[PDB]
Structure 1
Amino acid sequence: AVNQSSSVEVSSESYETIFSQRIIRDLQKELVVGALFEELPMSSKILTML
């Protein structure tokens, strides 16, 4: 961390730096089939019609 290069004063070891807890986000698919098709509510397990 503070190494590479540590010369000539304080060398110390490694983890000697502030870290950031913030996240970021890359790519995504845009959702075009999960919200485009009509919902049919039903109270059973199978629905039948002629």
Structure 2
Amino acid sequence: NQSSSVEVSSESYETIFSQRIIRDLQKELVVGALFEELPMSSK
């Protein structure tokens, strides 16, 4: 606040730090695993 008679040391003692992690929308993956597999045991 930095206006009254008393106050705190720095803005860090006026903030709440959250561990919560957020992410936006991610493009869907479709072609990655629609074809069936062919196991190969050689070059």
Using the size of structure 2 for normalisation, the TM-score is 0.61
After TM superposition, give the deviation of residue 7 of structure 1 in Å: 8.2
Point out where structure 2 has 5 or more consecutive residues left out of the alignment: none
After TM superposition, give the deviation of residue 16 of structure 1 in Å: 3.3
1:41 aligns to what?
Answer: 39
Aligned residues: 43
Point out where structure 1 has 5 or more consecutive residues left out of the alignment: 46-50
Using the size of structure 1 for normalisation, the TM-score is 0.55
More helix by share: 2
The structure with higher relative contact order (CA 8 Å, sep 6+) is 1
Structure 1 runs of 4+ off > 4 angstroms?
3-15
After TM superposition, give the deviation of residue 14 of structure 1 in Å: 4.4
